[PDB]
Design a binder for this molecule. Structure first.
Ligand SMILES: Nc1nc2c(ncn2[C@@H]2O[C@H](COP(=O)(O)OP(=O)(O)O)[C@@H](O)[C@H]2O)c(=O)[nH]1
Ligand SMILES: [Mg+2]
Length: 311
């Protein structure tokens, strides 16, 4: 198995991938067409589904039978990262289907998902995709751990994509197997926390990636925590998580970007994430339902022919 396999789906996933092409063979991209394929993608894996050239209900029956074929192109790995938009039609279908397959592999993985906010279609998709991940968490009895990134009004997709790529790199660093005290089994039991803590409920959880003790301590109701430290003198057993582990980073590790990084998993924040999306959609739909249009400028006295000609 490789150390980590990175999986990207849909346009948003393709776009984020462009920022990670230096990871090469470890990167696997999937989409239903080539609208988002650019030259830099030659450096990574790209697979497009057949017969599929925004509506998830339409895309699902077309792509479902192809999933096994997609999975054969994804090597066995010690950890996976999955990335896509919750709000489109392709990423939000391919992403969760592949995620289900990773759960069947008994894999350790996290996802980076985008809350798209343009339209009631985006918002409806966001809701259905979050519900999808919840259903998968239940059906596979496994936490589905996601770093949720909302497209906040006024912020460029470029900016958001940059932030996501930088977080993905921290996870790639986390799982690089080069840290003192930190095992592949330690990582597995961090993210698959229900395996050994059977009294906990598998569900959609959030991943919070923080670079200070203060920020990490402020994650509410933390369930499972992993901390990396460059200066082992700064290690402090803070917070109240159920599961906690620490790794010591190496100063000659060129990928070490920060002095300490905390990866905190909780789930209480998902309620507010859903509420924000549904309230936004309600407000947009209120406006749509309030919109009115004039009466017709034709009526029963008008002689209309088969082609719509009034002469
Ligand atoms: N953060 C981010 N959001 C995007 C990007 N492209 C599109 N979006 C938003 O995500 C929604 C889904 O787009 P996309 O991922 O291309 O759809 P898909 O190809 O059907 O999976 C769009 O309606 C936008 O609101 C991107 O590059 N970054
Ligand atoms: Mg697309």
């Amino acid at each position: 198995p490789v150390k980590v396999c990175l999986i990207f789906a849909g346009g948003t996933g393709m776009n984020v991938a462009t920022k990670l092409v230096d990871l090469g063979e470890a990167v696997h991209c999937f989409d239903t067409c080539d609208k988002n394929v650019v030259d830099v993608h030659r450096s990574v894996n790209v697979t497009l589904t057949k017969g599929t050239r925004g509506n998830r209900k339409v895309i699902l029956p077309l792509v479902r039978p192809q999933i096994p074929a997609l999975m054969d192109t994804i090597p066995e790995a010690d950890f996976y990262i999955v990335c896509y938009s919750l709000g489109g039609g392709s990423g939000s279908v391919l992403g969760p289907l592949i995620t289900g397959q990773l759960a069947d592999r008994k894999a350790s993985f996290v996802s980076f998902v985008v809350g798209a906010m343009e339209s009631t279609d985006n918002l409806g998709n966001d809701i259905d995709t979050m519900k999808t991940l919840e259903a998968i968490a239940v059906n596979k009895h496994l936490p589905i751990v996601v770093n949720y990134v909302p497209n906040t009004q006024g912020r460029s997709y470029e900016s958001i994509n940059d932030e996501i790529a930088e977080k993905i790199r921290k996870v790639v660093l986390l799982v690089n197997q080069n840290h003192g005290r930190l095992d592949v089994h330690d990582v597995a039991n961090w993210v698959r926390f229900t395996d050994k803590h059977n009294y906990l409920i598998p569900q959609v959880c959030e991943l919070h990636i923080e670079t200070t003790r203060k920020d990490a301590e402020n994650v509410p109701e933390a369930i499972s925590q992993l901390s990396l430290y460059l200066d082992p003198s700064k290690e402090v057993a803070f917070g109240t998580p159920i599961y906690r582990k620490v790794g010591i980073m190496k100063v000659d590790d060129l990928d070490v970007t920060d002095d300490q990084i905390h990866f905190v998993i909780n789930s209480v924040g998902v309620v507010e994430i859903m509420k924000t999306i549904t309230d936004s959609k309600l407000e947009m739909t209120r406006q749509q339902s309030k919109f009115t249009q004039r009466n017709p400028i034709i009526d029963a006295d008008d002689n209309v022919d088969e082609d719509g000609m009034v002469v």
